Ligand binder design. Structure first.
Ligand SMILES: CCn1/c(=N/N=c2\sc3cc(S(=O)(=O)O)ccc3n2CC)sc2cc(S(=O)(=O)O)ccc21
Ligand SMILES: [Cu+2]
Ligand SMILES: [Cu+2]
Length: 505
């Protein structure tokens, strides 16, 4: 039973380039088995870490900076977490590939799940093309993050510790004078279950498993008993009584958070997955599903001396427990001011999306569903296709589509499209039983436009149960072979992921 708020929040160091010039910035990152202590009272934990760190180093780039990262695997040939060998398939047991989540990235640098590699690239997957990924960064400033994306192993490799932040700074943002430097802090939130000996627990099977069930077996969801921020269990952060910017990243496998401050204070949302909102939005609470990012300002100016808990009210396999998962971290407003707070919390942030969208080239209707496998396990599917089935989502480069995502299942799925960001058009409830019985879509209420939080640009979006969600994206500027998928990792791996081919005629 781990005492809350006894370790300081780590802030990952900013990765330094191996080589840098005005034309090119070159980085190296090596995946390593490592050990770090996750709580004051735990023995050190075995982990897989980018450059031996959990989370990985934070990478900072400018818009249009010509960046190269050689992601290397120096991992052991056997996993320390339970591999289910029935969900896919001579290949190595341990395979890896890094996806820069949110990256406007050429397809062979996107971290395709079948572009994996084993240690030193000894073996490579069928869609591997290159060692050194290229990130031209021709996109709006935003909070990105990087993490493993290997076929059939993503839930394990991420849970092992392969996550890191990547921030794109646009020099144009600077006139806004948003909190910066030490007043701009990433918060990577990961839930974990940890054994008494300090080792990570990840389930090798569902509860009360039939003896015919593979062993190990995948589970459809995982809720951790403990919450970590930047690699420490329920940490505290000393802050100055002034404005801070936080880059809030949900890097958890399944868990959705619903965040608040326990003094009833407000957040100011300045940004979503895809960058700055056109206007700042004052929020008392916000939902944050796997792979979503909220760029927020918290103004501690009026709370000097106070301890304020960043709290959580979203359940995960049950109601939050006030003593455990209802807590994320604690702010202590006890750091003396190092200088005048010259930062701002502006109302006006950026241009609205150009109202003159392109013409709608196509409208895809897509269903979230699940069948059962030969062992009785749920298999989560996009439009009843398996990963290996021939590609059906085939937008043309430079064209705009609307995707209507129909969710008749009992849960929310956070759906991520690679390469692009998109606008959220609306959500609308429908008759679930009728849809299940006849395949016919009968709305039970009007279309609800998104909340202000979702009026800018998104790349990972919650599709709630009993709703049709509509989004719009322009597919470009690159063509090639990408993916879209649920970002509950346990779903992603079996098998709620599909190829997405962006074509050039
Ligand atoms: C919310 C406005 N909206 C859409 N926006 N799409 C946009 S706005 C936009 C701005 C830029 S730019 O800012 O980057 O240049 C690039 C691409 C853009 N796209 C295409 C993704 S598409 C749509 C359809 C319906 S309808 O279906 O109900 O008629 C209703 C309302 C709609
Ligand atoms: Cu899902
Ligand atoms: Cu992905």
């Amino acid at each position: 039973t781990l005492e809350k708020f006894v370790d300081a929040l780590p802030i990952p160091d900013t990765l330094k380039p191996v080589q840098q010039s005005k034309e090119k910035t070159y980085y190296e990152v090596t995946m390593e088995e490592c050990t770090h202590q996750l709580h004051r009272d735990l023995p050190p934990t075995r982990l897989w870490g980018y450059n031996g760190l959990f989370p990985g180093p934070t990478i900072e780039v400018k818009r249009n900076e010509n960046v190269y990262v050689k992601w290397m695997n120096n991992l052991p040939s056997t996993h320390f977490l339970p591999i289910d060998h029935t969900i896919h398939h001579e290949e190595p047991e341990v395979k890896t590939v890094v996806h820069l989540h949110g990256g406007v990235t050429p397809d062979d640098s996107d971290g395709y799940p079948e572009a994996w590699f084993s240690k030193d690239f000894e073996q490579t997957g069928p869609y591997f093309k290159r060692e050194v990924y290229h990130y031209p960064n021709q996109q709006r400033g935003a909070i990105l993050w990087y993490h493993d994306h290997a076929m059939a192993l993503t839930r394990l490799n991420v849970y092992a510790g392969l996550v890191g932040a990547y921030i794109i700074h646009d020099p144009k943002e600077k006139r806004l004078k948003l909190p910066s430097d030490e007043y701009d802090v990433p918060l990577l939130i990961t839930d974990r279950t940890i054994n008494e000996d300090g080792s990570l627990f990840y389930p090798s099977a569902p509860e009360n498993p039939s003896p015919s069930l593979p062993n190990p077996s995948i589970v459809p969801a995982f809720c951790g008993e403990t919450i970590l921020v930047n690699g420490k269990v329920w940490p505290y952060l000393e802050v100055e009584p002034r404005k801070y910017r936080f880059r809030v990243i949900n890097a958890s496998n399944t868990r959705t958070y619903n965040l608040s401050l326990d003094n009833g204070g407000d957040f100011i949302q300045i940004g979503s997955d895809g960058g700055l909102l056109p206007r700042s939005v004052k929020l008392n609470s916000f939902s944050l599903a796997p792979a979503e990012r909220y760029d927020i300002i918290i103004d501690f100016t009026a709370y000097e001396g106070e301890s304020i808990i960043l709290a959580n009210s979203a359940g995960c396999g049950g109601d939050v427990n006030p003593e455990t998962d209802a807590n994320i971290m604690q702010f202590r407003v006890t750091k003396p001011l190092a200088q005048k707070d010259e930062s701002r919390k502006p109302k006006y942030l950026a241009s609205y999306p150009s109202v003159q969208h392109e013409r709608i080239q196509n409208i895809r209707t897509l269903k979230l569903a699940g069948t059962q496998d030969e062992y009785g396990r749920p298999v989560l599917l996009l439009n009843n296709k398996r990963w290996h089935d021939p590609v059906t989502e085939t937008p043309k480069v430079g064209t705009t589509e609307i995707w209507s995502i129909i969710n008749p299942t009992r849960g929310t799925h956070p759906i991520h499209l690679h390469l692009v960001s998109f606008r959220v058009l609306d959500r609308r409830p429908f008759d679930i039983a009728r849809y299940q019985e006849s395949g016919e879509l009968s709305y039970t209420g009007p279309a609800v436009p998104p909340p202000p939080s979702e009026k800018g640009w998104k790349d990972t979006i919650q599709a709630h149960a009993g709703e049709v969600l509509r989004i719009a994206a322009t597919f470009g500027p690159y063509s090639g072979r990408y993916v879209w998928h649920c970002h509950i990792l346990e779903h992603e791996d079996y098998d709620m992921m599909r190829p997405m081919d962006i074509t050039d005629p």
